[PDB]
Amino acid sequence: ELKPKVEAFLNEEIKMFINGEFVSAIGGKTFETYNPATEDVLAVVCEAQEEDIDAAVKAARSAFESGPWAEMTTAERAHLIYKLADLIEEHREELAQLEALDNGKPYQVALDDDISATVENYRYYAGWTTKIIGQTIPISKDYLNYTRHEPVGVVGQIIPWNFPLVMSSWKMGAALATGCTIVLKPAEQTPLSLLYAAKLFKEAGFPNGVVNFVPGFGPEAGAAIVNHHDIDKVAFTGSTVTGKYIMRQSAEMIKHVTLELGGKSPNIILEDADLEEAINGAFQGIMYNHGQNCSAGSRVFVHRKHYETVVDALVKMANNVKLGAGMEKETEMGPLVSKKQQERVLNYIEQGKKEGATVAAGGERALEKGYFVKPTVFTDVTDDMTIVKEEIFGPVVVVLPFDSTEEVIERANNSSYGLAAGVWTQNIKTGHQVANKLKAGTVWINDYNLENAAAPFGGYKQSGIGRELGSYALDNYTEVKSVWVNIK
Amino acid sequence: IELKPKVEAFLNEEIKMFINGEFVSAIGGKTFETYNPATEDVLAVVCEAQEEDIDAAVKAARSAFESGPWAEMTTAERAHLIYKLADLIEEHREELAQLEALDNGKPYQVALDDDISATVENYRYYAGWTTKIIGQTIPISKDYLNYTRHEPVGVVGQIIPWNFPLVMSSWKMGAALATGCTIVLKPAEQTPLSLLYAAKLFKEAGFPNGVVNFVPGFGPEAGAAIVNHHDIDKVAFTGSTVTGKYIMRQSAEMIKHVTLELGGKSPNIILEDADLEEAINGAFQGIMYNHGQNCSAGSRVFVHRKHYETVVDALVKMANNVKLGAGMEKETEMGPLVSKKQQERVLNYIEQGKKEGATVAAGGERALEKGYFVKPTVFTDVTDDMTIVKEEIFGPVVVVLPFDSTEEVIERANNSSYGLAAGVWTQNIKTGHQVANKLKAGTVWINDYNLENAAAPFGGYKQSGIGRELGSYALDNYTEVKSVWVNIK
Amino acid sequence: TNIELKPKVEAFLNEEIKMFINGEFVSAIGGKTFETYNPATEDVLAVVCEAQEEDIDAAVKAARSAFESGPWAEMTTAERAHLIYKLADLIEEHREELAQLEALDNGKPYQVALDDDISATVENYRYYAGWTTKIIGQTIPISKDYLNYTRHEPVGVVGQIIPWNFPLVMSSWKMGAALATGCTIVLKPAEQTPLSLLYAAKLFKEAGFPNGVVNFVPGFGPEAGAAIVNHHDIDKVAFTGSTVTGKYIMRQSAEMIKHVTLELGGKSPNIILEDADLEEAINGAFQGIMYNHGQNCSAGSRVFVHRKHYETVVDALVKMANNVKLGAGMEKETEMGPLVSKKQQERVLNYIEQGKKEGATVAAGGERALEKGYFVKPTVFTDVTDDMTIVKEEIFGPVVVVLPFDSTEEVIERANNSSYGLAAGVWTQNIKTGHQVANKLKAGTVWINDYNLENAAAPFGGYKQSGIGRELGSYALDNYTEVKSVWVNIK
Amino acid sequence: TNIELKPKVEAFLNEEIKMFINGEFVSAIGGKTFETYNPATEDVLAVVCEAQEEDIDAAVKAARSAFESGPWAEMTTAERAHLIYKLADLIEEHREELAQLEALDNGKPYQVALDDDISATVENYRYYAGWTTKIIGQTIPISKDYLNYTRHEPVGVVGQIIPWNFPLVMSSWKMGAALATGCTIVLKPAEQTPLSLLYAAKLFKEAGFPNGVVNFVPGFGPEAGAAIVNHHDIDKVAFTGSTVTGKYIMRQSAEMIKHVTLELGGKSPNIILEDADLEEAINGAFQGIMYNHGQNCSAGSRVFVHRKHYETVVDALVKMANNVKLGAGMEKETEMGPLVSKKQQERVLNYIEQGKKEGATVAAGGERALEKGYFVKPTVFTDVTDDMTIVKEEIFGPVVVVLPFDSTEEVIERANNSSYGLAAGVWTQNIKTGHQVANKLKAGTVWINDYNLENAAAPFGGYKQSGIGRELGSYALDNYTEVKSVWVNIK
Ligand SMILES: NC(=O)c1ccc[n+]([C@@H]2O[C@H](COP(=O)([O-])OP(=O)(O)OC[C@H]3O[C@@H](n4cnc5c(N)ncnc54)[C@H](O)[C@@H]3O)[C@@H](O)[C@H]2O)c1
Ligand SMILES: NC(=O)c1ccc[n+]([C@@H]2O[C@H](COP(=O)([O-])OP(=O)(O)OC[C@H]3O[C@@H](n4cnc5c(N)ncnc54)[C@H](O)[C@@H]3O)[C@@H](O)[C@H]2O)c1
Ligand code: NA
């Protein structure tokens, strides 16, 4: 049942947030957002055009060069961010409902993971605003040498639909902590949650134009941001194809880019794994968030001795998941975010069948309406098959036998991706030997899918450029100035 | 200046490439010529790297990275290798400085005192880092050990220009090597000799086969093969904005990390309470150092109105007095531009400066009878929209502009697509730190100019680049951060 | 015109003031109590439960059990951080309560206790709440056969003793960094000024600190403090106070090979060179010594003035001293309050006598003020020489010594000829001279064209006999850590 | 099979051994000398100049002057770095000379002195030369009104005292980090083992160290050591050695509020869990104690074994102990040399008798060995209890104690129930159990599936009464530094 502040919000058309103000599109356009469990329209949203991105950017440039955001102390800036965290926590139920309605994930996991992650995130980055230190370099007695880590200026941020609010924080926490200002575009599929949270930025006391949210379409609002002459730096999370474009375009202006893109991450069950723990790890690794997760362990490698056991366990668990609407208490898995996404994973399933793979579970739509896909388990697969190389992005796992540690490292590594990886082994040497050898940004040894504001996240190879999260994330929003003072 | 025997012997033969630890010719026998810019004579014939040769270099670098000595070796052992190399470079300092003077065109004495010694010092400095490239241990929860590894990114492709040839090879390789990367490096076609002589010294220091591979040639073939190679993990370039754009564009197809060091139009700013003597010299040397073939050159000299006439007069005199000659003549203070193409380009900018209404207070033409020389030039009666105050000329060309307030000069100095460096001259403690804080540049010198050191980072804001070189900072470009979570529950 | 008492301080002051051990409010086991006064009136302000060795003992066992097991030992870093941040919010919410208590118990003016002490305390806890998730160790690349990493573990139960001159702020300097690291605490506030801290105990409870993490044991140096210094089960000791007591502590800690952090006194020079902006430097000079009644360790007790400006700054310093409005801290018009005790008042009046005996001129002040209270007049000493008792030793009152100099190399040597080295100020408009002078002075803190600035993010401490170690900033965390180097064979 | 003396050590030992003060080789002012012995043969190995209080005062003035003015004070970091690297190269050039001096003077085998000691000394200097250019402070973004920065300034003249068991390498531990930061040094080698360091003085001079940057004063602890400890103009003191002398030094240092770092003894535990790889663990347990004849503070002198393997490991250590080949350091066959002195042999023989009369069983050794020299047999003690002298106190010979255990929780407790906390070893093939156990052990360094590993890049130090501070790694630089926070007012 809908919370009253959510009912009130969804009762009017959704406005953009530009220069501390809730506004319509300058030319009045709007777009629809849907509920993927029902396929009905959930809201009508003001649609940002190029001229709106230009208003957002002017407002951001201005808040950065002059005024309170530019005059504030690092303690004062930190307080703003902490207060935002508190506010998001006060409205945890309202935001969780919006993610459940707009994205489609279960309400309770939006509350326990997404909203708590977002809150911890801001809290973490609020602590960095006073600790972004530069250096004093001893070189000569004739010179004082030091570096300042100055905020790069106005940043352009584009994020996807699969963890809408979490990803807004991954982006803004680090950038805001260095003292930048922000033009952010949420995904056309999932703008609501960020646009509700705007109120909380206003109420926490963020000066006008420090943040600006411009919902819309990728080729218009999105591309306006990437091609704008007065955006200093761009950060993107999304598909590899859009990734490549953003970097291409960013080259025209010698603009720093940080990309978080796709994965085909291996999750590896060696002979001395604790089998009961690795099975649950493998299953949650792919099935968490309906498989709509960059870091999903969509290639479960199993030592040959345990293959038939883990496959039997993964089939049983696949058929056991409770499919339903995110706003139903009993739901464990919701649907895909859109019709186009469901069609896409269903075409990947058909491709796998026609290439010779065997569906041991799932492999088809689920329910009467909504964009559901049954959790799917593929067997009899080879490394050269399409389904084993390309990111599917649905609850679809491929399960591969291997006979030696050296073999599985090489097959795990033979990929264009390198975002994450899992390794299950009880042995101390093997754990760290394998972790060392895998070409992946994040390695989990006897676990999978763990994220924290304090730990860096990002890809090797075509999974990205740069890291978000941790201390490392600050570097992207900074510009290093080496000052030399003649004291001779 | 008498040519060293070892230089004589080196120039007496065809100049080989260095791939997988051996001195080689190009697979298909192609060659090109390098000139002495002071005489226009052929200086040496060099083996020209083709696509095929870059391929041989990348395989060798891949092999040295995945297996073998380089891959197994301790950090202390790698540090010792890099240090032995610096010692060798220092032992051959005179040979290297002559090649830098012959090939590039600068005065011997400055190549010795500045270039060679800074090459030695930068390797010396980065050998100390190998053992100190640390990651983190992060406290999150009692249920996990969290730690990060800073793994070397792998095979790295590096392209450099011609204005500081050896020093720039050390800016690229010092940090790369210190992290444990392996390297395919392309020197500039105008100035391959220093680096290919230096190759003898990597071999003698004990570098394993393939750690370092030097492929001289041309940008559209050797350069482009580097940029576009699927097996190179990361690319680093310095040179023209136009080539840098291209490289970042091509790097998008492999989602490949890029470091770019590009041009500048750096302001050198003289406020009312400058020590004027020291600021006039700093202004003159800021633009004229290395014939103005310096991306950080103080090419816009802003002067508070009270001092404007005084510094214009002084820069005209100083400009008129610089002694042009060959780098190998002991009397020479400034040599020539590196090529006929570059002389033509800077002379074109002089004419465009005249067409637009500016006045040439000094110089403004070619000099001498042989050589790509251009006279030191002072432009006056200038405005902010003129192409000469906006674009990188890369010559001994300076633009002198008056101003009347501190806020005004900050706004004008910052209105550039560039942002590499800046100079500020003031005896006031508040104003010095204030002005420096507000200038959008990678490096700011308060009461000095053109100071670089292995330990202080260097790079541009805006279109002057992406990333920093030198210092601790440069390490990060050759690194790949791995976050490891160990469940200890 | 009196600042009216908050209902909550009134209630607090009506009962015996209890100690805080193992999350509970308790009297001393033997039932002893001591009195604390209002130094403006001399009246008894509260009666307080007095901690003996046996009470310190109970606090340590409580600290030990909270460190070895339980919620504080199992909590995530984000959970700890949230606690520390909620604490800062509670302190800000009771800002007026806390500030009335400093003004009453310590003596300083209510308004500055509010604007400065209280907000600095709040700011300090918010800064350290941020470090909790960020105390990072290293991953050292040595050899492909090992995995080498360090952990920065909390050292354990820490013994913390603080003085009376900034009572709440100093409690935050000690506890912020230590709690941030995951340590647990037994902390003795000064017998002159226990109230502020024992009120704040409410707020550690209301924020939800587990029992035993934090324990406050008020009482006397030779009993409660000494029992902290000598307890076998306290892992590390941190002290701020007199140089005499600091040596006793360091000497006693020798017997248990215990890490020690000391913040002691100072004779900090404030240096006005020829090209100072004089109007500013005169205020820096006056404010550098007179802030908090000179009961401030970083105080610019020596004002060095280039000779061109000596007569000018003396005249301004005299006019200013004679103009400060002395009175009760709870009274609105008050600029300067009294000294914390009769004992301290005697100490400073006594240094004033030694100043006159040694030949110096009292240019202003030089005696007690008002009819009651521990007040001393802002004092200006003129005709001074570097060998005099008053120029060498820390007085701790509103007493300043003015010294001319003729050159920069001279003033650097004269400033530096001291056993102390807590802080220094340099006033000069020249870019080179500022940094040159700052580089050459032997002091933990140098302010260039300013004085008495403190912030959570910037470390503070002394060179030579002004201390060992640093407080504030990131540096402070190292005092409460224990480094462990783990090697994992992966051959 | 005798290892043949190097011409250069022949020439060195053929003369009276001189002190190194202010760049020159000198005698003691009063002309006193002392002898050092060959602990294999008990003959006089050399006659060395004895530093007295008056010689420490000369050494301190020279270091003070070298710190305040002259090349060392004006030099760039790149230049300081180059002196330290040239030293490292010269040491490596003289590797055989120096390893023979350790073998003659300390008693350890030549080949191990060369492979370990000399090679680590070199690598230590090489690593610390890399730090001179990278000792960075902070710029702290606090407010737009200030530039806040900190400087890590060298602390000044430092006094360093080292023991006799790893003579040259321990001198590098002290000096690398101290010189890296820009300090100057008065260093006293142990009376038992002065030779390797005073030979190494040739190399400081040949490398181009300015006069006074480094001063070496051989002598007796209660005269030359105490003169360093009690000197008013030494800014900081570092020491490794006995708990007893360390408490003295800290006690004495209190008077000057002088920073102390201490590396003291240990009773380090080496824990074989049920799932250890037993082959490896057995060698680890054996090498862990017997390396350097047990004259190693981090020695695994308490070998804990799961009861499943107790008999298997006791039988193996007994066989290995009875097989060690004892002899002179300069004989080729030697696997273990003698103890350092007659006094050291008598102390360890006393502990063995104490073990016997408390009721423990000597399963091997337990007595002196050979005809001449200060040798003691490798000893295995069994049937031992936690409360026994031999399982509590540091013996410092080739003496191990084997203790069974039944649960992991139990072994963590018994291993931590000690006043010591220098190092520990944990042997388990399980990923989880390795790290959990390493986390719960109260020791400065923990080895997982190995033992006795040290490296210039990884910090070393003790928890509890094993020490204060760390040496090695970046961590060692903080001990020789003094942090200065500058605040520049920019309006
Ligand atoms: N790395 C991730 O976390 C992530 C997230 C979502 C999707 N993906 C991958 O992307 C695939 C397809 O998803 P999609 O097409 O909806 O995502 P997408 O790559 O189009 O990116 C989504 C975001 O980028 C914006 N965008 C689209 N075109 C743009 C343009 N030309 N300029 C600027 N911004 C633009 C979108 O509006 C949205 O904000 C999935 O199958 C999956 O493999 C990855
Ligand atoms: N920490 C270590 O690595 C280490 C090294 C050697 C000995 N020890 C312990 O100490 C025991 C043996 O004692 P020791 O003979 O080494 O004596 P010691 O610890 O006193 O000697 C070590 C150093 O300190 C000096 N010294 C001694 N008394 C001094 C004083 N009063 N002032 C200044 N310096 C002084 C000595 O000359 C020597 O250089 C061993 O059995 C062992 O347990 C520990
Ligand atoms: Na009181």
Coordinates of C-alpha atoms in Angstrom, one line a residue, chain B residues 194-350:
Chain B
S194 CA 69.1 9.9 -28.2
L195 CA 66.7 7.2 -27.3
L196 CA 68.2 4.7 -29.7
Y197 CA 71.7 5.4 -28.3
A198 CA 70.2 5.1 -24.8
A199 CA 69.0 1.6 -25.9
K200 CA 72.6 0.4 -25.5
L201 CA 72.3 1.4 -21.9
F202 CA 69.1 -0.6 -21.1
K203 CA 70.8 -3.7 -22.5
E204 CA 74.0 -3.1 -20.5
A205 CA 72.0 -2.3 -17.2
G206 CA 70.6 -5.9 -17.5
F207 CA 67.0 -5.2 -18.7
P208 CA 65.4 -8.6 -19.6
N209 CA 64.4 -9.1 -23.3
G210 CA 61.4 -7.2 -24.3
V211 CA 60.8 -5.1 -21.2
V212 CA 61.5 -2.0 -23.3
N213 CA 61.1 -1.8 -27.1
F214 CA 62.0 1.3 -29.2
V215 CA 60.4 1.7 -32.6
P216 CA 61.3 4.9 -34.5
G217 CA 59.2 6.0 -37.4
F218 CA 56.3 8.1 -38.5
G219 CA 53.0 8.9 -36.7
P220 CA 50.7 7.6 -39.5
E221 CA 52.3 4.2 -39.6
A222 CA 54.4 3.4 -36.4
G223 CA 52.4 5.8 -34.2
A224 CA 49.0 4.6 -35.5
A225 CA 50.0 0.9 -35.2
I226 CA 50.6 1.6 -31.5
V227 CA 47.3 3.5 -30.9
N228 CA 45.3 0.8 -32.7
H229 CA 46.9 -2.3 -31.3
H230 CA 44.3 -4.6 -29.6
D231 CA 47.0 -6.1 -27.3
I232 CA 48.4 -2.8 -25.9
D233 CA 46.7 -2.2 -22.5
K234 CA 47.1 1.5 -22.1
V235 CA 48.3 4.4 -24.0
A236 CA 50.2 7.6 -23.0
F237 CA 51.0 10.4 -25.5
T238 CA 52.4 13.9 -25.6
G239 CA 52.3 16.3 -28.5
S240 CA 49.8 18.3 -30.5
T241 CA 46.2 18.7 -29.4
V242 CA 45.1 17.4 -32.9
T243 CA 47.0 14.0 -32.5
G244 CA 45.8 13.7 -28.9
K245 CA 42.2 14.1 -29.9
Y246 CA 42.7 11.3 -32.6
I247 CA 44.3 9.0 -30.0
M248 CA 41.6 9.4 -27.4
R249 CA 39.0 8.8 -30.2
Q250 CA 40.8 5.5 -31.3
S251 CA 41.3 4.4 -27.7
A252 CA 37.4 4.5 -27.2
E253 CA 37.1 1.3 -29.3
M254 CA 39.2 -0.8 -26.7
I255 CA 38.0 1.3 -23.7
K256 CA 41.6 2.0 -23.1
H257 CA 43.0 4.4 -20.4
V258 CA 44.7 7.4 -21.9
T259 CA 47.2 9.9 -20.5
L260 CA 47.6 13.1 -22.6
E261 CA 50.1 16.0 -22.2
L262 CA 49.2 18.6 -24.9
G263 CA 50.0 22.3 -25.6
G264 CA 49.6 25.5 -23.7
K265 CA 49.2 29.3 -23.8
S266 CA 50.4 29.9 -20.3
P267 CA 50.3 33.3 -18.7
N268 CA 53.3 34.8 -16.9
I269 CA 51.8 37.5 -14.8
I270 CA 53.7 40.5 -13.3
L271 CA 51.7 42.4 -10.7
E272 CA 52.5 45.9 -9.4
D273 CA 54.6 44.7 -6.4
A274 CA 56.8 42.3 -8.4
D275 CA 60.5 42.5 -8.0
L276 CA 60.7 43.8 -11.6
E277 CA 64.4 42.8 -12.3
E278 CA 63.7 39.2 -11.5
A279 CA 60.3 39.2 -13.2
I280 CA 61.7 40.6 -16.4
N281 CA 64.4 37.8 -16.5
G282 CA 61.8 35.2 -15.6
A283 CA 59.5 36.5 -18.3
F284 CA 62.2 36.5 -20.9
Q285 CA 63.5 33.0 -20.0
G286 CA 59.9 31.7 -19.6
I287 CA 59.2 32.1 -23.3
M288 CA 62.7 31.8 -24.8
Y289 CA 63.8 28.6 -23.0
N290 CA 64.3 25.9 -25.7
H291 CA 63.5 28.4 -28.5
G292 CA 60.0 28.4 -27.3
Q293 CA 59.4 24.7 -28.1
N294 CA 58.1 24.2 -24.7
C295 CA 54.4 23.6 -24.0
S296 CA 54.7 25.4 -20.7
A297 CA 56.3 28.5 -22.3
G298 CA 55.1 31.8 -20.8
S299 CA 53.8 33.0 -24.2
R300 CA 51.3 35.5 -22.8
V301 CA 53.2 38.0 -20.5
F302 CA 50.7 40.0 -18.6
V303 CA 52.1 43.2 -17.0
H304 CA 50.4 45.6 -14.6
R305 CA 50.1 48.9 -16.4
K306 CA 52.6 50.7 -14.3
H307 CA 55.3 48.3 -15.4
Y308 CA 54.2 47.7 -18.9
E309 CA 56.5 50.1 -20.9
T310 CA 59.5 49.1 -18.8
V311 CA 59.2 45.3 -19.4
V312 CA 58.3 45.7 -23.2
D313 CA 61.5 47.8 -23.7
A314 CA 63.5 45.2 -21.6
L315 CA 62.2 42.2 -23.5
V316 CA 62.8 43.8 -26.9
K317 CA 66.5 44.5 -26.0
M318 CA 66.9 40.9 -24.6
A319 CA 65.3 39.5 -27.6
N320 CA 67.5 41.4 -30.0
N321 CA 70.6 40.2 -28.1
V322 CA 70.2 36.4 -28.1
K323 CA 73.0 34.8 -30.1
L324 CA 71.6 32.3 -32.7
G325 CA 73.8 29.5 -33.9
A326 CA 74.3 25.8 -34.1
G327 CA 73.9 23.7 -30.9
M328 CA 77.4 22.4 -31.4
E329 CA 78.9 26.0 -31.5
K330 CA 80.0 26.9 -27.9
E331 CA 79.0 30.6 -28.3
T332 CA 75.3 29.7 -29.1
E333 CA 72.4 30.8 -26.8
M334 CA 69.5 29.7 -29.0
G335 CA 69.4 27.2 -31.8
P336 CA 66.9 26.6 -34.4
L337 CA 63.4 25.2 -34.7
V338 CA 63.4 21.4 -35.3
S339 CA 62.3 21.3 -38.9
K340 CA 61.4 23.3 -42.1
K341 CA 57.8 22.5 -41.4
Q342 CA 58.0 24.1 -37.9
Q343 CA 59.9 27.2 -39.0
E344 CA 57.3 27.7 -41.7
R345 CA 54.5 27.3 -39.2
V346 CA 55.9 29.8 -36.7
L347 CA 56.7 32.3 -39.4
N348 CA 53.1 31.9 -40.5
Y349 CA 51.9 32.9 -37.1
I350 CA 54.0 35.9 -37.2

